[PDB]
């Protein structure tokens, strides 16, 4: 109901009507990236400079109807002045902390299921067992190794269709996945995330990260396993070796 209604409201005004009519689907990306905002050259300097202002961050308009304009002593939490090239309003950082102490609460039980990679890292480290540190010269030789320890033996494009069919089943188009490994992955990640309401985009991004294999060139000495490379900073050094066995093994 609503969606077509703001569609009609947009088409009511002449300029947006022209934008909707003359613009083709292919140009979607271009106009979506059409912005006057330059990409910052020195982000640290301005982050240290903007945070000294009042209302340094930006938030959706809806914040004006969930968080009061001021806190107990009267420190303002949000302003009604919109951003430069968006309908979002500039708000103070307190509106963040406020949201974490009296804002609406939900059931975050499914975030562990979504962010599978990070929670698997935490579980692997929690059950790890350290050993003695041995001091001897390490011959670090540079090798190509896979960093992602949960890659399902799929490439970027190869798993992209799987991700769409898992999250966006209707926009798949011609592709119907042939490999049965992809079939089982789709089934599992479909039944697992059937009602998760985090965001389609973040779900797709994390599925891409988990399933897609990624490789990088690093100086290693021993190890060479996927689980042993994520902790390469902790097990191998310039003149010391720290024996380690992740919780998985």
């Amino acid at each position: 109901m609503e969606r077509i209604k703001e569609l009609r409201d947009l088409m009511s005004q002449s300029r947006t009507r022209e934008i909707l009519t003359k613009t083709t689907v292919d140009h979607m990306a271009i106009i979506k990236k059409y912005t006057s905002g330059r990409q910052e050259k020195n982000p640290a300097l301005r982050m240290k400079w903007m945070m000294a202002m009042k209302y340094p961050i930006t938030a959706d308009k809806r914040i004006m109807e969930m968080i009061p304009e001021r806190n107990e002593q009267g420190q303002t939490l949000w302003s009604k002045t919109n951003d430069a090239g968006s309908d979002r309003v500039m708000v103070s950082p307190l509106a963040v902390t406020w949201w974490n102490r009296n804002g609406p609460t939900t059931s975050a039980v499914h975030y562990p299921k979504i962010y599978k990679t990070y929670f698997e890292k935490v579980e692997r480290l929690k059950h790890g067992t350290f050993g003695p540190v041995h001091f001897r010269n390490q011959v670090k030789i540079r090798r190509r190794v896979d960093i992602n320890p949960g890659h399902a033996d799929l490439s970027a494009k190869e798993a992209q269709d799987v991700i769409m069919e898992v999250v966006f089943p209707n926009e798949v188009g011609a592709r119907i996945l042939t490999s049965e490994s992809q079939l089982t992955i789709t089934k599992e990640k479909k039944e697992e995330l059937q009602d998760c309401k985090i965001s389609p985009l973040m779900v797709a991004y994390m599925l891409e990260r988990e399933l897609v294999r990624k490789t990088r060139f690093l100086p290693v000495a021993g190890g060479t396993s996927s689980v042993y490379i994520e902790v390469l900073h902790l097990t191998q050094g310039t003149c010391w070796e720290q024996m380690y066995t992740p919780g998985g093994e």
């Binding site: 041995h134 001091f135 001897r136 010269n137 390490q138 050094g237 310039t238 003149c239 010391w240």
Partner: peptide, 14 residues
């Protein structure tokens, strides 16, 4: 610390 590590790579001990 780089000095210390380089010297300790010679004698197998911190």
């Amino acid at each position: 610390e780089s000095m210390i590590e380089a010297e300790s790579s010679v004698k197998e001990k911190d």
